[PDB]
C-alpha cells in the first residue's frame, strides 16, 4: 500500500501515523485479552507504521 | 619533563663500565645540564633555559636572540 | 530442465518405475506425485484435537531426478529445454521441439 501512501501530504501522513499507532495499541490489547483471532492484523499495523515513517523521512 | 638540553638536544646515553678484569656493566653518561637566566632585551625580560655548557658556548657565539628565535622556530615556548 | 506443480510426469527410477501421475508439490529436489510412492503411517491419537489415530496411507516424496516429464503425444519420457518463442521463454520437449502441454 506504499503506492497509495505516497499520494498523500506530510500532514495527512502524520494523522495516519497517529491513527495507526492507536489501532496497534487496540490490537495489542485485544490480543492480550484473547479476543483476536488474526495476528496478521498486528503484523500489518507494524509494517504500515514503518512504511509511513519511511515515507515521511523521504518527503521531508 | 626530561634531562634534555633545549639548545643542542643532548640527553643521557648508555654505555659500559669496563673493569681491569674486563667485566662490563651498563651505565649512562649524563649531560652537563643546568638552569640559566638570560636577559632578552627585545622582550625586556629574563628567560630561564635548561641547557648544557656547550649550549652556553653556542649562545656565546651566536647571540641570545638568534638562539631564542631558532628554538621558537623549532616550536618551543621561550 | 524444469518440472512444476501441475505437470504430468512418469517415474524413471525406483520401485514406482514405469508408473505415471500428476505431481502435487515440488520442494528442494524432492517431488510428490499423486497416488505414487505410498507409505503407511501409524498415527497415535491426538489428545487435544480428538482425531482417533489409525494406519493411514499417504504419499512420500521422490528425488526429482527420478521423474521425467511425460510427452502427451508419444506417451514417453522426455527432457525439458527452453526456447524464446516470440518474446517469452517457454518449455519445450527435447525430442520433438514442441511446447509443453499446460496442466
Amino acid at each position: 500500500k506504499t503506492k497509495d501512501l505516497r499520494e498523500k501530504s506530510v500532514e495527512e501522513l502524520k494523522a495516519l501515523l497517529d491513527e495507526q499507532q492507536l489501532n496497534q495499541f487496540r490490537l495489542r490489547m485485544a490480543k492480550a485479552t484473547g479476543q483476536l483471532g488474526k495476528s496478521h492484523e498486528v503484523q500489518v499495523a507494524r509494517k504500515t507504521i514503518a512504511r509511513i515513517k519511511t515515507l515521511l523521512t523521504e518527503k521531508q | 619533563m626530561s634531562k634534555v638540553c633545549q639548545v643542542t638536544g643532548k640527553r643521557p646515553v648508555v654505555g659500559n663500565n669496563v673493569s681491569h678484569a674486563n667485566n662490563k656493566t651498563k651505565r649512562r653518561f649524563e649531560p652537563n645540564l643546568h638552569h640559566h637566566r638570560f636577559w632578552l632585551e627585545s622582550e625586556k625580560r629574563f628567560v630561564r633555559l635548561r641547557l648544557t655548557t656547550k649550549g652556553m658556548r653556542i649562545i656565546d657565539k651566536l647571540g641570545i636572540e638568534k638562539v631564542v628565535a631558532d628554538l621558537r622556530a623549532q616550536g618551543q615556548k621561550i | 530442465a524444469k518440472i512444476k506443480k501441475g505437470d504430468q510426469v512418469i517415474v524413471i527410477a525406483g520401485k514406482e518405475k514405469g508408473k505415471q501421475g500428476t505431481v502435487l508439490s515440488v520442494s528442494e529436489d524432492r517431488v510428490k506425485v499423486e497416488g505414487l510412492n505410498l507409505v503407511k503411517k501409524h498415527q497415535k491419537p491426538n489428545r487435544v484435537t480428538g482425531a482417533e489415530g489409525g494406519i493411514v496411507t499417504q504419499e512420500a516424496s521422490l528425488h526429482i531426478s527420478n521423474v521425467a516429464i511425460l510427452n502427451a503425444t508419444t506417451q514417453k519420457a522426455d527432457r525439458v529445454g527452453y526456447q524464446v518463442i516470440d518474446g517469452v521463454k517457454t518449455r519445450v520437449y527435447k525430442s520433438t521441439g514442441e511446447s509443453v502441454a499446460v496442466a
Partner: protein
C-alpha cells in the same frame, strides 16, 4: 508526554487470582507495563485510553526466571506490573 509514548506505556492486563480478586473487591486494575514506564506515565496512559479517573498507582518489578530447556539454559525478561486504583465506582 506524547501520544507515541502513551500508546506504548501499557502492554496488557494481568490474569491471575490476585488480580481478579482485586478487581472484584477493591476496584483495582492490574496491568503489564513497559519496564521503563513511570507512575505519572501510567496514570496519563490509563486516563487517556480508558476514560477513567486514577487516584494512585503502585508498581513492582519481578525479575525473570532462569530455566534450562533441553540442553541449553535461558532466561526470561523482567516484568513490571502496575496496580492502578480507580476513583469510586469505575470500569
Amino acid at each position: 508526554m506524547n501520544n507515541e509514548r502513551i500508546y506504548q506505556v501499557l502492554k496488557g492486563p494481568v490474569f491471575s487470582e490476585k488480580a481478579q480478586v482485586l478487581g472484584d473487591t477493591a476496584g483495582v486494575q492490574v496491568f503489564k507495563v513497559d519496564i521503563n514506564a513511570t507512575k505519572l506515565e501510567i496514570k496519563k496512559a490509563v486516563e487517556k485510553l480508558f476514560g477513567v479517573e486514577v487516584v494512585k498507582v503502585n508498581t513492582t518489578i519481578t525479575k525473570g526466571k532462569t530455566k534450562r530447556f533441553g540442553r541449553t539454559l535461558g532466561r526470561r525478561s523482567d516484568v513490571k506490573k502496575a496496580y492502578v486504583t480507580l476513583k469510586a465506582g469505575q470500569d
